[PDB]
Write a protein that binds this ligand. Structure first.
Ligand SMILES: Nc1cccc(C(=O)N2CCOCC2)c1
Lengths: 237, 300
């Protein structure tokens, strides 16, 4: 059934699972026409498919050409998501295929179920958690590869960098969700926190800066403050 | 006009014959039902006074044999049987008629209700849904489960309705996932009509039989089947015009006949609101929508 706080440690057991977030698949700018009407212009998007145990991010870039001449794009985007996730599963060796796929939005349940009819033993699950995966496009290297794409493309990243050499999957996921929650609540401040000290760099092969254990504790505390800070600015507390 | 005699009425029971019903008291001198219209299937059904649990009954067609009812005190129910000795049967019936111990099927001349509820229902098709090949009539009760219900437990006592499942490989062509799920025309016209039912008359016959078993026995899996067969049509963008017009007539008479006080359990809010207001055929069921809105406006 649904994934929630009660069954949270299941994410880090040894049954392969993937989260699928479709928030950033269909992205538009809304603008005025010369006649003073409103129109949309699509921009490239992406499916965010993540193994929370290993940090494996299968980033399928959705190029704007896939919308050309199509109607009801927000509905189509869910089905296109499910088609691409199904294609990814089929492309993986049997021993790498997931035993569960957790969708971050319940509207993805039926499209994914239908596309995965050929895999009756893969469970398609919703979640009660409000995960901040929409903020994925606030990670500069991910946004860069999405916006530069000129055709459909899959790009493989590890979203935990090398953190699993020093921390467990549970702790890595908590750190990731904290960083993303911060970027989602106040992107400018969050990014200021992450880069303020010019001596800490992001390795070419990494997404986040190369913080020591002690520096991660400081960083993590600053992100919590921000999420609380912004929570006051919003609710006047 | 044909007759279903009863040997006796040893236990107090409410007896139905099609949409009619009457109460018989314990050991009351009741010996059956006469003047049954020829040309239609019929259902004779029972609810005991002491245990309203288990409504049960028999579908039959008097053109297929001479049938009678006899209570079995071991199994505790009124059983239908066939009499093969035609002269014995005619003689039994004539004596009961002479002593006026039979109720008359009470059909008003103007009234086409039973025809309209059974237009496409044939005994031969009933006998394939309800498998008991040694009898010409078919037993149904409130508790019997459907083949589909069993897949989700005695196979011989099952209702073998055609399985309909909108999230199934049968319903969804590889590579037309979104198309077939949002527009079920493929599944309706190719898989079901051309493939399984052969024609719309057989589809409507099964839909009508499912409704009648839901209404008369409170059979829950039959209600599920009836709604699934409605939803499959309404959720198809491409349906022959004659089928939509006939469906509107079928459902109109089903909704007209439904006991007002059973609507809460026999009608699925989601299916009906979707069918009348959101589906491709939301504008094609004029008669059904008018009766539903005037009779069950709460559900909607
Ligand atoms: N999606 C996915 C699957 C397998 C491995 C990886 C992974 O760790 N990375 C591969 C690409 O760059 C190095 C890091 C990612």
């Amino acid at each position: 059934g649904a994934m929630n706080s009660s069954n949270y440690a299941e994410l880090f057991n040894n049954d392969i699972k993937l989260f699928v977030d479709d928030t950033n698949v269909y992205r538009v700018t809304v603008h005025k026409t010369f006649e003073g009407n409103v129109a949309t212009k699509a921009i490239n998007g992406c499916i965010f498919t993540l193994n929370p145990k290993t940090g494996h991010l299968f980033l399928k870039i959705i190029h704007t050409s896939v919308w050309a001449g199509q109607k009801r794009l927000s509905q189509l985007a869910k089905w296109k998501t499910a088609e691409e996730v199904s294609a990814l599963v089929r492309s993986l060796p049997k021993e790498e295929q997931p035993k569960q796929i957790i969708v971050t939005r319940k509207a993805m349940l039926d499209p994914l179920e239908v596309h995965m009819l050929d895999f009756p033993n893969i469970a398609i699950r919703p979640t009660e958690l409000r995960l901040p995966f929409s903020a994925a496009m606030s990670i500069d290297k991910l946004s860069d590869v999405v916006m530069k794409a000129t055709e459909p493309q899959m790009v493989l990243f590890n979203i935990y960098d090398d953190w699993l050499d020093r921390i467990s999957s549970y702790t890595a996921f908590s750190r990731l969700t904290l960083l993303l929650r911060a970027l989602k609540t106040n992107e400018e401040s969050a990014k200021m926190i992450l880069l303020s000290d010019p001596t800490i760099t992001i390795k070419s092969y990494h997404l986040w800066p190369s913080f020591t254990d002690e520096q991660w504790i400081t960083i993590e505390s600053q992100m919590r403050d921000l999420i609380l800070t912004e929570y006051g600015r919003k609710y006047n507390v | 006009m044909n007759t279903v005699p009863f040997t006796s009425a040893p236990i107090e029971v409410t007896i139905g014959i099609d949409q009619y019903s009457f109460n018989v008291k314990e050991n009351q001198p009741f010996h059956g039902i006469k003047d049954i219209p020829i040309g239609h299937v019929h259902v004779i059904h029972f609810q005991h006074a002491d245990n309203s649990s288990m409504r049960y009954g028999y579908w039959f067609d008097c053109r297929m044999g001479n049938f009678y009812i006899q209570y079995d005190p071991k199994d505790g129910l009124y059983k239908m049987m066939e009499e093969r000795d035609g002269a014995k049967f005619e003689n039994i019936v004539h004596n009961f008629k002479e002593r006026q111990m039979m109720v008359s099927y009470p059909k008003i001349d103007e009234d086409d209700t039973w025809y309209n509820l059974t237009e496409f229902v044939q005994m031969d098709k009933i006998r394939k849904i309800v498998r008991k090949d040694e009898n010409q009539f078919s037993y149904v009760d409130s508790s019997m489960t459907t083949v589909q219900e069993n897949e989700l437990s005695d196979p011989a006592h099952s209702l073998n309705y055609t399985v309909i499942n909108f999230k199934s490989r049968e319903a969804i062509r590889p590579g037309h996932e979104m198309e077939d799920f949002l527009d079920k025309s493929y599944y309706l016209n190719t898989v079901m009509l051309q493939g399984i039912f052969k024609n719309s008359s057989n589809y409507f016959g099964e839909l009508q039989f499912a409704f009648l078993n839901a209404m008369f026995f409170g059979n829950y899996g039959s209600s599920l089947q009836w709604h699934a067969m409605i939803e499959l049509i309404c959720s198809s963008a491409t349906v022959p015009k004659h089928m939509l017009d006939k469906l509107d007539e079928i459902l109109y008479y089903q909704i007209k006949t439904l006991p007002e006080q059973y609507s809460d359990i026999l009608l699925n809010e989601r299916v009906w609101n979707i069918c009348l207001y959101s589906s491709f055929q939301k504008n094609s069921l004029h008669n059904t929508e008018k009766i539903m809105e005037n009779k069950y406006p709460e559900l909607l």
